[PDB]
Design a protein around this nucleic acid. Structure first.
Lengths: 306, 115, 225, 201
RNA sequence: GGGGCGUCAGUAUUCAAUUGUCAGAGGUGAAAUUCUUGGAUUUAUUGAAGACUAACAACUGCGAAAGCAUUCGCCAAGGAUGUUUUCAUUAAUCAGGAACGUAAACUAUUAGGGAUCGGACGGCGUUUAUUUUUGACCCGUUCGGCACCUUACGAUAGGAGUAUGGU
């Protein structure tokens, strides 16, 4: 396994820390100059080493590793349906997660631990009781990656779905990719998800919920304002701008009353077609979509003989 | 006409379309039956054999041999000594897409006394 | 369409046909045609030169495309290869095998087959096994359905069979032995000399197996080609 | 995914040919059932000759044969005609979904009287268990001396293989027919499409 | 294809090695357990081990029975036939005793004939046979034996319902 620097304001990239470790493949790496490194394995030999120790965890190949932001806890996941948290400073053990039905693939810590497993389920467990707080279903293959937001889970059924923990029901689902999906990265400042898999495409998603909530808010603002100006024009008797605003607001139970009023005003202009020259002017200056929507209301008013 | 030797292992569970040179040592291209069908139930099917034979004939015509000697076998030790549907369907698709067939032989392992 | 594998198992695919070159195959002397095919072998370099693999391989080819005669649709022969030239692959005899379709196509009910095995050594010190098969002749103008030879008569037939194949394969070299195996002179002489014991419907030699060849000599191996 | 289309349309370089050998009591029946055989093999494109002098059926691929699996169909056809399957059934192997199989059962019983009893147990009272097996498995079973020759679809070939081995190994074919009837009843409804059915047999 | 001992092969299966591999393979009605980039299943070639002797293989052969199927050698034994072979009742039958050792589940002749194999004899002849042997095929006679059909010559060897009253 190895540790590289990233020098952003240069073209210099070095692999200056290396770690021999165990005899099998280093499966996963976790990081709390950095503090140290915890490496997993294809065999059962889990290790921890400092930058300028081994232990036995499970029976099968382990899968994933994750640190807390304060660096007091650490959990490891494997194929023999156990998740293991242990003390990170000493060689001690804080306990054990009881089990995720077939084989747990990914763990995640909340800045609450998340386990995504080999069945089509995903669970939320605690430190306090070492039991699942929440259980979720809905996938069609393995999940293989669970990422914290600011939660999201990819699948192996090429769908990546987001939801929230206190509610516990599915919020949204995402369907860009080809055959498979493997991993998810996240922007650390805002909420941007980077999904990639066995297919070569990588898709970058951004949250739009704040923007569409602002749009729906200002839409309801404009709606209540123009509905009140419609009621104002009805009360004042300005049938012209009332009819224009009713055709804009698309609701016709008041539009019919305006039309019965304007064809029975009791003082009609003699040259005008519908009695009012201004309503003649707007019926002359209607657009194509407003003409077609007015015709679609005219057949319904033409049904009634009244 | 460069004759390549096609071993068609037609069992009841999966069919093996395999193409070797005249030696038997150097595998040119093989496509198994189950890698073309999502279902392990329908892994041994005439559709699976047709897809495998089309892919194998396409690769071997990209390499330019355009002639095969076909050796068909099955599970023969204590097995059935009869090929599954893969043999008939793979030979049909294989000669339906190019591939002038040469010599056909059914080389099944027949035990003199097994059990 | 959807894959099935575990985490990190599909390696990046490399082209395997850059490292392959073709090699034309020539048959030995007593066969009628010489160019019999083409073999795709690996590319030679240090750390396992490909001529070692070309010395290792054997081929199996029918006799119809060798003699240009479809009388021999059966009797597949086997060719070792021990020598190499420039874009060439010189071969030698290794064995002679029937097809199992003819081995089923020869066995009938109510008649006896007699099998005989010999381990004979030619004058060039090649040890080889000859497996001969011989089916019993149903005599025309007969009425009885079963043409059964007695067991002592079968033992006498097998004794004369092994005597003929030993006396007519111990004297010649391997090239003359293949030249006698091709038009089946041995089975004809067994048919001719066993008919005073019990007439035999057809005598073939169903297998030839070369066990050990103690010499590598390019002189005789090129005197073939 | 399982259906097979008939061949619509020279695919042979070396003119392939196969042979099988038959005795005299089959030579009579083959001599007066042969024109049906050569008629259907001419419809498939393969020349079929019969030799009463040596006692040999030969098939050979002609110039105008286009189906390349037809030579395997014809080889199996002359194998069954040599092994004394009746002629319309031997010609029924020439359809697309059929296949034959020969089950060697003489190796399964050391004794002789026990073997005769178990073979007649496979054949049943008045052939009723045999035709019940043929109905439940959609096969044609012919208990042929020391062998058993079956024809049909590949599923039925597998089930009659299991039933013939279990009949020779002293499990009764009436028990196996009850097992197959239960499996047919369970596969009728797909509400129980994928469970372990061992809780019913 | 009776038994013992040795020997010779044949494939197939498993295991291992060497290559070409390059994504599944295996099972099933579907699945799952399992093996699978250190390369499974497959392709080819060798080597070892243990087992068994396909097809021929039968309305057959041998052994008292269970049983007995690769070739060749050795060892005794046995059957039938033929003889121009001997002692002349030695014999028949079994009390007592002695040797060999997962199954069941549809069930004095008959009077000859057609087959069958083991001798022995005879022969118009086809093929060995370059011509005598000798064998194969066909035919007839004769003993002996597994089995078929016909004829007998005859024979002979409580269950299911419905009630009623007790316990």
């Amino acid at each position: 396994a190895r540790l590289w620097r990233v020098d952003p304001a240069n073209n210099s990239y070095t692999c200056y820390a290396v770690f021999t470790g165990h005899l099998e493949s280093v499966g996963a790496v976790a990081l709390p100059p950095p503090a140290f490194l915890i490496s997993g394995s294809q065999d059962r030999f889990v290790q921890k080493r400092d930058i300028p120790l081994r232990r036995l965890a499970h029976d099968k190949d382990i899968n994933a590793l994750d640190i807390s932001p304060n660096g007091k806890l650490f959990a490891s996941a494997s194929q023999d349906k156990t998740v293991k948290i242990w003390d990170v400073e000493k060689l001690e053990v804080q306990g054990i997660l009881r089990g995720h039905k077939r084989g747990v693939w990914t763990v995640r810590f909340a800045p609450v631990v998340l386990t995504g497993s080999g069945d089509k389920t995903i669970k939320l467990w605690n430190l306090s009781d070492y039991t699942c707080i929440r259980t979720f279903e809905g996938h069609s293959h393995n999940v293989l990656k669970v990422v914290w937001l600011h939660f999201a889970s990819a699948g192996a059924d090429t769908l990546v779905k987001v939801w929230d923990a206190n509610t516990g029901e599915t919020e949204c689902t995402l369907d860009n990719h080809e055959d498979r999906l493997w991993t998810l990265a996240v922007h650390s400042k805002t909420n941007i998800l980077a999904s990639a898999g066995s297919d070569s495409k990588v898709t970058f998603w951004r949250d739009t919920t704040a923007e569409t909530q602002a749009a729906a808010a200002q839409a309801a603002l404009k709606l209540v304002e123009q509905e009140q100006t419609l009621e104002n024009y009805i009360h004042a008797g300005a049938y012209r701008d009332a009819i224009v605003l009713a055709l804009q607001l698309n609701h016709p139970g008041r539009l019919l009353n305006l039309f019965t009023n304007v064809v029975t005003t009791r003082n009609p202009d003699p040259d005008s077609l519908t009695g009012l020259k201004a309503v003649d002017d707007v019926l002359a200056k209607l657009s194509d979509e407003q003409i077609f929507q007015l015709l679609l209301r005219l057949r319904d008013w033409n049904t009634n003989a009244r | 006409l460069v004759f390549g030797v096609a071993r068609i292992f037609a069992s009841f569970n999966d069919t093996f379309v395999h193409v070797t040179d005249l030696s038997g040592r150097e595998t040119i291209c093989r496509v198994t039956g189950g890698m073309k069908v999502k279902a392990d139930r329908d892994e041994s099917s005439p559709y699976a054999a047709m897809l495998a034979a089309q892919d194998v004939a396409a690769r071997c015509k990209e390499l330019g041999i355009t002639a095969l000697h076909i050796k068909i076998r099955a599970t023969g030790g204590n097995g059935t000594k009869t090929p599954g549907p893969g043999a008939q369907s793979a030979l049909r698709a294989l000669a339906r897409s190019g591939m002038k067939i040469g010599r056909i032989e059914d080389v099944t392992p027949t035990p003199s006394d097994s059990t | 369409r959807l894959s099935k594998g575990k985490k990190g198992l599909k390696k990046k695919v490399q082209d395997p046909f850059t490292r392959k070159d073709w090699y034309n195959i020539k048959a030995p002397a007593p066969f009628a045609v010489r160019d019999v095919g083409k073999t795709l072998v690996n590319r030679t370099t240090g750390l396992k030169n490909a001529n070692d693999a070309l010395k290792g391989r054997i081929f199996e080819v029918c006799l119809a495309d060798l003699q240009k005669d479809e009388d021999h649709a059966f009797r597949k022969i086997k060719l070792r290869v021990d020598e190499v030239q420039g874009k060439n692959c010189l071969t030698n005899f290794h064995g002679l095998d029937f097809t199992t379709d003819k081995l089923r196509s020869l066995v009938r009910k109510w008649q006896t087959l007699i099998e005989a095995n010999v381990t004979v050594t030619t004058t060039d010190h090649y040890l080889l096994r000859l497996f001969a098969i011989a089916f019993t002749k149903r005599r025309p103008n007969q009425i009885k359905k079963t043409t059964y030879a007695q067991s002592s008569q079968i033992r006498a037939i097998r004794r004369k069979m092994v005597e003929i194949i030993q006396r007519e394969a111990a004297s010649c070299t391997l090239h003359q032995l293949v030249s006698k195996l091709i038009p089946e002179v041995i089975g004809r002489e067994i048919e001719k000399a066993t008919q005073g014991i019990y007439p035999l419907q057809n005598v073939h030699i169903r297998k030839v197996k070369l066990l050990k060849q103690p010499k590598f000599d390019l002189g005789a191996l090129m005197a073939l080609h | 995914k399982w259906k097979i289309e008939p061949f619509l349309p020279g695919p042979f370089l070396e003119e392939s040919s196969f042979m099988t050998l038959f005795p005299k009591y089959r030579e009579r029946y083959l001599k007066d059932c042969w024109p049906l055989v050569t008629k259907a093999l001419e419809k498939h494109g393969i020349a079929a000759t019969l030799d009463i002098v040596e006692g040999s059926m030969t098939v050979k691929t002609t110039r105008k044969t286009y189906d390349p699996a037809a030579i395997l169909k014809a080889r199996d056809l002359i194998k069954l005609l040599a092994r004394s399957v009746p002629a319309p059934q031997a010609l029924k192997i020439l359809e697309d979904g059929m296949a034959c199989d020969i089950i060697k059962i003489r190796s399964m019983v050391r004794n002789k009287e026990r073997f005769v009893k178990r073979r007649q147990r496979l054949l049943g009272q008045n052939g009723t268990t045999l035709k019940a097996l043929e109905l439940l498995t959609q096969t044609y079973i012919l208990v042929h001396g020391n062998t058993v020759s079956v024809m049909g679809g590949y599923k039925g070939l597998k089930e009659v293989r299991r039933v013939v081995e279990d009949t020779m190994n002293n499990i009764h074919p009436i028990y196996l027919i009850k097992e197959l009837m239960i499996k047919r009843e369970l596969a009728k409804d797909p509400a129980l499409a994928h469970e372990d059915w061992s809780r019913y047999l």
